[PDB]
Design an enzyme around this catalytic site. Sequence first.
Site, PDB file in Angstrom:
ATOM      1  N   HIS A   1     -10.411 -13.579  -3.675  1.00 18.27           N
ATOM      2  CA  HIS A   1     -11.706 -13.400  -3.017  1.00 18.27           C
ATOM      3  C   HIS A   1     -11.583 -12.713  -1.669  1.00 18.27           C
ATOM      4  O   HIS A   1     -12.614 -12.378  -1.076  1.00 18.27           O
ATOM      5  CB  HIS A   1     -12.485 -14.718  -2.950  1.00 18.27           C
ATOM      6  CG  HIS A   1     -11.989 -15.660  -1.903  1.00 18.27           C
ATOM      7  ND1 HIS A   1     -11.298 -16.807  -2.214  1.00 18.27           N
ATOM      8  CD2 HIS A   1     -12.177 -15.689  -0.563  1.00 18.27           C
ATOM      9  CE1 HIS A   1     -11.026 -17.476  -1.103  1.00 18.27           C
ATOM     10  NE2 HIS A   1     -11.548 -16.815  -0.088  1.00 18.27           N
TER      11      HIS A   1
ATOM     12  N   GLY B   1     -10.967 -20.195   6.641  1.00 16.45           N
ATOM     13  CA  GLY B   1      -9.818 -19.428   7.082  1.00 16.45           C
ATOM     14  C   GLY B   1      -8.489 -19.926   6.549  1.00 16.45           C
ATOM     15  O   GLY B   1      -7.481 -19.202   6.647  1.00 16.45           O
TER      16      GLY B   1
ATOM     17  N   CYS C   1      -7.686 -20.493   3.463  1.00  8.48           N
ATOM     18  CA  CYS C   1      -7.400 -20.027   2.113  1.00  8.48           C
ATOM     19  C   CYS C   1      -6.064 -19.293   2.093  1.00  8.48           C
ATOM     20  O   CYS C   1      -5.728 -18.554   3.024  1.00  8.48           O
ATOM     21  CB  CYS C   1      -8.512 -19.077   1.701  1.00  8.48           C
ATOM     22  SG  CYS C   1      -9.953 -19.945   1.064  1.00  8.48           S
TER      23      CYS C   1
HETATM   24  C1  LIG Z   1     -11.130 -19.832   2.302  1.00 10.80           C
HETATM   25  O1  LIG Z   1     -10.561 -19.633   3.599  1.00 10.80           O
HETATM   26  C2  LIG Z   1     -12.097 -21.038   2.414  1.00 10.80           C
HETATM   27  C3  LIG Z   1     -11.324 -22.317   2.495  1.00 10.80           C
HETATM   28  C4  LIG Z   1     -12.058 -23.502   3.068  1.00 10.80           C
HETATM   29  C5  LIG Z   1     -13.362 -23.581   3.512  1.00 10.80           C
HETATM   30  O2  LIG Z   1     -13.535 -24.844   3.953  1.00 10.80           O
HETATM   31  C6  LIG Z   1     -12.367 -25.503   3.783  1.00 10.80           C
HETATM   32  N1  LIG Z   1     -11.493 -24.691   3.248  1.00 10.80           N
HETATM   33  N2  LIG Z   1     -12.848 -20.983   1.182  1.00 10.80           N
HETATM   34  C7  LIG Z   1     -14.236 -20.701   1.123  1.00 10.80           C
HETATM   35  O3  LIG Z   1     -14.872 -20.561   2.109  1.00 10.80           O
HETATM   36  C8  LIG Z   1     -14.768 -20.593  -0.277  1.00 10.80           C
HETATM   37  C9  LIG Z   1     -14.763 -19.111  -0.736  1.00 10.80           C
HETATM   38  C10 LIG Z   1     -15.310 -18.916  -2.150  1.00 10.80           C
HETATM   39  C11 LIG Z   1     -14.473 -19.598  -3.221  1.00 10.80           C
HETATM   40  C12 LIG Z   1     -15.452 -17.420  -2.505  1.00 10.80           C
HETATM   41  N3  LIG Z   1     -16.098 -21.130  -0.371  1.00 10.80           N
HETATM   42  C13 LIG Z   1     -16.207 -22.530  -0.276  1.00 10.80           C
HETATM   43  O4  LIG Z   1     -15.269 -23.262  -0.154  1.00 10.80           O
HETATM   44  C14 LIG Z   1     -17.571 -23.131  -0.463  1.00 10.80           C
HETATM   45  C15 LIG Z   1     -18.756 -22.511  -0.902  1.00 10.80           C
HETATM   46  C16 LIG Z   1     -19.702 -23.572  -1.007  1.00 10.80           C
HETATM   47  C17 LIG Z   1     -21.073 -23.646  -1.365  1.00 10.80           C
HETATM   48  O5  LIG Z   1     -21.702 -22.476  -1.765  1.00 10.80           O
HETATM   49  C18 LIG Z   1     -22.831 -22.634  -2.619  1.00 10.80           C
HETATM   50  C19 LIG Z   1     -21.723 -24.869  -1.356  1.00 10.80           C
HETATM   51  C20 LIG Z   1     -21.049 -26.023  -0.954  1.00 10.80           C
HETATM   52  C21 LIG Z   1     -19.721 -25.961  -0.604  1.00 10.80           C
HETATM   53  C22 LIG Z   1     -19.062 -24.715  -0.621  1.00 10.80           C
HETATM   54  N4  LIG Z   1     -17.764 -24.423  -0.321  1.00 10.80           N
END
Ligand SMILES: *[C@H](O)[C@H](Cc1cocn1)NC(=O)[C@H](CC(C)C)NC(=O)c1cc2c(OC)cccc2[nH]1
Lengths: 305, 305
Positions: free
Chosen positions: A41, A143, A145
């Site tokens: 991603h 961040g 990830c």
């Molecule tokens: C990557 O650095 C990050 C890791 C993270 C974030 O918080 C703790 N660790 N991952 C994301 O930000 C990730 C990216 C996606 C998979 C493209 N998105 C989420 O973790 C995320 C999206 C989301 C939503 O969206 C509808 C709703 C509730 C929770 C949630 N977590």
Amino acid sequence: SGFRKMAFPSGKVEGCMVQVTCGTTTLNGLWLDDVVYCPRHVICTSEDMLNPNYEDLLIRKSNHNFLVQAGNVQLRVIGHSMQNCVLKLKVDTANPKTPKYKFVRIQPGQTFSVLACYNGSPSGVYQCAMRPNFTIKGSFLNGSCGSVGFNIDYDCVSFCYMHHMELPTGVHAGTDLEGNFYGPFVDRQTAQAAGTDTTITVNVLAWLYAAVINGDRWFLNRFTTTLNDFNLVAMKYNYEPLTQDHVDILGPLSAQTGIAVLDMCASLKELLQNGMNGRTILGSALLEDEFTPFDVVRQCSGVTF
Amino acid sequence: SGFRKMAFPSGKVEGCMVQVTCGTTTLNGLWLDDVVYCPRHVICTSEDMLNPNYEDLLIRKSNHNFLVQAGNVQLRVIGHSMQNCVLKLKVDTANPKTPKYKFVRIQPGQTFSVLACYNGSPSGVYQCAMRPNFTIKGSFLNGSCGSVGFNIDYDCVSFCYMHHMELPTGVHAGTDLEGNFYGPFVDRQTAQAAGTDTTITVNVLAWLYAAVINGDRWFLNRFTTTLNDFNLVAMKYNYEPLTQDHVDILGPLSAQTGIAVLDMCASLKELLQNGMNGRTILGSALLEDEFTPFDVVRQCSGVTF
Ligand SMILES: *[C@H](O)[C@H](Cc1cocn1)NC(=O)[C@H](CC(C)C)NC(=O)c1cc2c(OC)cccc2[nH]1
Ligand SMILES: *[C@H](O)[C@H](Cc1cocn1)NC(=O)[C@H](CC(C)C)NC(=O)c1cc2c(OC)cccc2[nH]1
Ligand SMILES: COc1cccc2[nH]c(C(=O)N[C@@H](CC(C)C)C(N)=O)cc12
Ligand code: NA
């Protein structure tokens, strides 16, 4: 004496962490030999996030679109490909700090250390377990990830987890190093939820053995049980079933301590039915389930790497 | 989200660990530039372990008597001296992996990471607090002596602890890197007692703030207390008095969450008087006192090294 939630020494993994930037997105990558592994991603824009077509997005990128930095040094990307939910960036330089390594996919209940990183630099190290519901109870901010989880076996680093996301309950989801998620989760910004979790029974038993090794044994009763009768109680308290394989895995701890596994199970049954009544075990007021049998043997024996 | 007992990345310290043998005793040393630091009791034998005359024993030792091994390489010892309870072995090779470092003496209530080692090799890493009674609650076996505790700030390793002893109660004692014990302990083969311990109130408050930052809010109440009224209650529970300096130190966390310290103190008072009624805070059924305010800020803001 003492018993602590101990992480593996992190130096071997520290030497593999880099930063990967594509567009406005920066996250961590793992540099082993001449390949950098990171979450796919990284190629998404904020809009792409809701419903990305990763194959189409990747076709649009060229090698030069990936900025890979190892400390102060920019690594030259000479190829790229996607394997499930991971990107593999071929670089023109092999990492001189690459440890002996393997990629493994772990089972629920197995533990590992996480080296939490931001912008390619480490923040800290902690131990955690793959939960029965295929999440981990970590400490991760946006961040993080591309941070990885691993075990060390002598001199060999077995990488088992790469971080991708946080679920609504504040627990964490990710992939193995082949890019396949643990659990049913997907790498998009969509509605997802962890299933109901359960307690890792074989690990609770291992920790009770650690307590006995350390002379904390007030909970040992004078009964035995069958595996069937124990599991009937375990189900009522949201514990995983105990199998004969688990019993045999616990054999050496049972022999070290003199407490047969089914006798320990009778003591655990009483703890579940009656509670701990304000008492602690190894300093804890709850039954701990994030130590495996081998974690106990390792720590109580002084195993080194 | 998530809040874990998180150790510093250990690689910079791993590069400094060596094995030191004198006679039949093997323990760990810390190799910085051309000096290896280790516990002085390595020079003793069982005949003099009860009360050694270290000055006389050191005179009778030859440089040849110390076998120092850095991985697969023997380091030639070219001099030996003693500073308090630490032996300093001058070697003919400066450690090329020496990090930027300082030796610091930490205060009770502060925390550090321990890299537990045997035979000069690491077994694991975990966080410890220096207790008010100058012990630490670690995980250490015979052979772990010379393992160190440390903090990292940017690129600088501040070493604060070297392990020497386990008390009958199963807690641990040692020195700073100038060889001065924390607490009223001596490096002799005797059973020694610590003074009565207390709970580190400012750290409990810091961890309640960490819980709020991570969405665990059930224990908050609408009440406030005076500092004097808070201390009347907490002292009954063997908590350290909360001072205005402690209130000031919590200022940043109070500003981040919008919860005044004396508002949080009323939540802590209720937890002390009424318990948790079957609930947990950050996964614990006990009030945790081994996170400093700085530890909370570091983890929740993603500080790296
Ligand atoms: C990557 O650095 C990050 C890791 C993270 C974030 O918080 C703790 N660790 N991952 C994301 O930000 C990730 C990216 C996606 C998979 C493209 N998105 C989420 O973790 C995320 C999206 C989301 C939503 O969206 C509808 C709703 C509730 C929770 C949630 N977590
Ligand atoms: C050094 O490797 C070792 C560290 C250790 C041992 O268990 C956990 N960590 N330190 C010792 O073994 C230490 C050596 C002294 C400083 C010479 N001795 C003790 O910690 C010790 C001795 C002792 C006695 O002696 C009669 C009785 C009760 C407890 C106890 N602990
Ligand atoms: C009767 O005791 C046994 C019978 C059969 C197999 C056994 N394995 C262990 C075993 O590993 N103990 C550990 C030490 C322990 C404190 C974790 C070690 N020796 O390092 C003992 C044992
Ligand atoms: Na309040």
